Amino acid sequence: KSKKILIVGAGFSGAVIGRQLAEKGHQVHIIDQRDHIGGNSYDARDSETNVMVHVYGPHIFHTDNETVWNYINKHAEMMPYVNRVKATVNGQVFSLPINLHTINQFFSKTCSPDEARALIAEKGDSTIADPQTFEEQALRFIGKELYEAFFKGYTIKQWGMQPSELPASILKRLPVRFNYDDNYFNHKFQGMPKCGYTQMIKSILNHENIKVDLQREFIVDERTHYDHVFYSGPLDAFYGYQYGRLGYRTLDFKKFIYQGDYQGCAVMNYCSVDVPYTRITEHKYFSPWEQHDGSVCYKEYSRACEENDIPYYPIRQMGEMALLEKYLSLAENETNITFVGRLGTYRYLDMDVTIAEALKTAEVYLNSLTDNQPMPVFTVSVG
Amino acid sequence: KSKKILIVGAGFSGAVIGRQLAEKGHQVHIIDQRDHIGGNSYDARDSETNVMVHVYGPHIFHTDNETVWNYINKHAEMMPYVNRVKATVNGQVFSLPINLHTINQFFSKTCSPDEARALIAEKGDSTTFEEQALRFIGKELYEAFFKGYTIKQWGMQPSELPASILKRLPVRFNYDDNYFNHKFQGMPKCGYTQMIKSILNHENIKVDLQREFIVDERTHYDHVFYSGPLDAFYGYQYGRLGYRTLDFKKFIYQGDYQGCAVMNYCSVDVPYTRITEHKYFSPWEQHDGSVCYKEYSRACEENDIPYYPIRQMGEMALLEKYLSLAENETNITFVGRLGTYRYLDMDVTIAEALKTAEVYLNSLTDNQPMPVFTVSVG
Ligand SMILES: Cc1cc2nc3c(=O)[nH]c(=O)nc-3n(C[C@H](O)[C@H](O)[C@H](O)COP(=O)(O)OP(=O)(O)OC[C@H]3O[C@@H](n4cnc5c(N)ncnc54)[C@H](O)[C@@H]3O)c2cc1C
Ligand SMILES: Cc1cc2nc3c(=O)[nH]c(=O)nc-3n(C[C@H](O)[C@H](O)[C@H](O)COP(=O)(O)OP(=O)(O)OC[C@H]3O[C@@H](n4cnc5c(N)ncnc54)[C@H](O)[C@@H]3O)c2cc1C
Ligand SMILES: O=c1ccn([C@@H]2O[C@H](COP(=O)(O)OP(=O)(O)O[C@H]3O[C@H](CO)[C@H](O)[C@H](O)[C@H]3O)[C@@H](O)[C@H]2O)c(=O)[nH]1
Ligand SMILES: O=c1ccn([C@@H]2O[C@H](COP(=O)(O)OP(=O)(O)O[C@H]3O[C@H](CO)[C@H](O)[C@H](O)[C@H]3O)[C@@H](O)[C@H]2O)c(=O)[nH]1
After folding, report:
1. Does A186 touch chain B (CB under 8 A)?
2. How far does the signal peptide extend, from start to end residue (chain A)?
């Protein structure tokens, strides 16, 4: 039987789930409260300069998942692109992530890889058995000088808290490299779609069994016209924010135009706490295969997400997790709905992770029709 | 009618010309005086470390030519790779080619691209190599990055050399440190030797190694394609075309000796020109043991492999005399870096070889004479 499907959101989560089910003969209705598709991945051109702007932040595709990589290659031309971030601090410009060039520049040395290991080991504090905090992880592995130059001020700005109050996991992620490789990402596949993510998602949305209505909020009365709802809007918003709002950081993007090359790279971090923006992005450098004389730039400022701001990074401390638990207990009592995505599950997700989870979630719904069982509320562990 | 074709050299030029004609039914005899195929592109695995070594120095494939890219992708799997050269000088490490990071780090500034343009304009003269440098980038940069390395590389002071070359390396006022601006760039997964081995794999191709060209052989063939040195072909009767040669001192490090494929040393007081750490040309492989080369530049004497053609006034006048006798040859075409006395990238060599076979095939169907050169050189 051709099931009737409501999908709330036309970002990756919605577009991908809706595409898998269209292909199996289901009638998919995809709604979005915005006047364009794409969700947080939306990009669009600026009038004046013709620069393709990544409107909700630089969106660099990177994955080790060849399945996901092949999927997006059916819907776009993926161009090579290697993210190479610079950082301004202490009247100097550095290479990130921390590598052999950064170390040799910062400490004015000409160390080989093995000499740099010994130098950083000496600066590190190996008397810390298991770093719990962001500060401890930095003091254990990179030492005070590097910590205070590149990490402390940036991290206070980004998070609104002292690094002694943030988890070690945040920094556990970042490569301390003892060679001259300055690719920001380790993933095997990496790039940017030639015509942008909007066009890519438009291709994913281009199927006979998909209708997309824009400028249309979800209304709780609708659910009864559909056999199943996939919801990628905020979990707390779905329940009227009745227990309070899940905490997020948000960003203000302050747009400006320059006639020429404003900074000469896509991403420049400002690691000093005394520079009020976290970074400056110059969007034309995300599309290096194009030429543009004019340039759209963003200064980016991090702040607590208030009622009307777009939620970007989930805070996910005990408070926020306690709040999350209360929304979970209502969710578990639902039937015929599945909460997905960054907003539906209160998790930061990369594009390729979002895509993989959407493929899985469609798969689960297909298998559950074939097994005449019930579709669960979450297809991923969130507790 | 299938022609008997003799091809001298089993590098890119010979291999590609020979495959194009083998495919069209011609009988192809390729010879090479060395004990291996591949010419100067030849690579091989060191026994001890299993590292694929670029025997005649680093070879990075780069091209804007999509026909050529597609052509090698038929014979190899091209792995992505971006050449990113570092340079040690004055107690610091920098990226090359000179870019906005080099400038900022060198002068201790936080310039934007236009601010750096104004900084370099100031430092330039306004008041040849040593001329173009001082006018365009200033004393400090010229002396740090160019003056020492140029003397070591060419064996001459820069005061003695033409504006071009440096004109070919403009300061980049952005943070892009890719050595090559070309659309396509990569390394073959199994190395150039396999890639050339596949180009040579055809029933109509016979390859003989450790085999010297002998002029007496010419009369056994309908045509010869010659990719060995043009001057040698004519017995060096007017003198030897000037080249720089290179010596490589091999060593083995257990670990990562320097942490990048190529580190240049720009100081004249450092005797090698650069150090290459070969495992960095294959970043998809992992190797605990590392093969490295300190690299030294000298005048190419009679027993040395010729690397860089000098191509200054005397050498070009000398070339001209060998051109003017090649032009009266029949049933022979001179090709390649060595046959035409030019430095040629691998992509350009492949593009010219494909065009050379094409001109030959078209010369048979039109009953026309095959020219001696298929590119201009005089
Ligand atoms: C600042 C930032 C930078 C990032 N950079 C990268 C990066 O470089 N690389 C990378 O891989 N990932 C990056 N990401 C993550 C990436 O954006 C996500 O993986 C992707 O957006 C997740 O897609 P989604 O469809 O699940 O959610 P979303 O894109 O948020 O889409 C959800 C959609 O639901 C709609 N909606 C919500 N509620 C309703 C409702 N009530 N009624 C109707 N419509 C509704 C919204 O309008 C939205 O369009 C970044 C994320 C952020 C926040
Ligand atoms: C130091 C150096 C670095 C380079 N780096 C790059 C790079 O990074 N990227 C790039 O694209 N290109 C690079 N190149 C250029 C690259 O090597 C050439 O494009 C390639 O060698 C050209 O192939 P060929 O067949 O024309 O010449 P060769 O490879 O030189 O082959 C000529 C062959 O002919 C044989 N031969 C000569 N005379 C005789 C004879 N008398 N009898 C029998 N056989 C003979 C020789 O033994 C040799 O095998 C580099 C070159 C040099 C010198
Ligand atoms: O110059 C810098 C750069 C980073 N950081 C610290 O390192 C953290 C990680 O920063 P990234 O800019 O490298 O990462 P994002 O927060 O932009 O996104 C990262 O974290 C996400 C989880 O929230 C995803 O896992 C994603 O794949 C990963 O790149 C920052 O919050 C910050 O605390 C600094 O202190 N200084
Ligand atoms: O640290 C350096 C590096 C280079 N140079 C000067 O710049 C010239 C160019 O040298 P590169 O190492 O940049 O390049 P190659 O000479 O090895 O080969 C280059 O020039 C060739 C022509 O000979 C080809 O066009 C090729 O594609 C291109 O990479 C040198 O002769 C040298 O005099 C310096 O002064 N200092």
Report:
1. no
2. 1-22
